[PDB]
């Protein structure tokens, strides 16, 4: 094996799919989702490498 599948996942749509109240509640958690997306993007860049 050489590479995985370059999969990326959006929190706001996953956790609170098209929901205003849920998105507002999710804002309180800070950059959990920014760092989730950062980890997944780093993985994908590594796959290309």
């Amino acid at each position: 094996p050489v590479s995985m599948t370059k999969t990326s996942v959006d929190c706001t749509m996953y956790i609170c799919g098209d929901s205003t109240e849920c998105s507002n509640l999710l804002l309180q958690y800070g950059s959990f989702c920014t760092q989730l997306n950062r980890a997944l993007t780093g993985i994908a860049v590594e796959q290309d490498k």
């Binding site: 959006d10 706001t12 749509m13 098209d18 997306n37 993007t41």
Partner: protein, 49 residues
Amino acid sequence: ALDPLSETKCTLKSFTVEKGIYQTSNFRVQPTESIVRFPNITNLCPFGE
């Protein structure tokens, strides 16, 4: 919100953007109209009686 370059600068929290491709926001089609579909209204209770 002025332009994509400004979105990139805001996401990176920087004024100088090193060469590359950056994921800034998420595209999402918003729903236009609402649809409500229910079975045919039948057996109207005899308040006439």
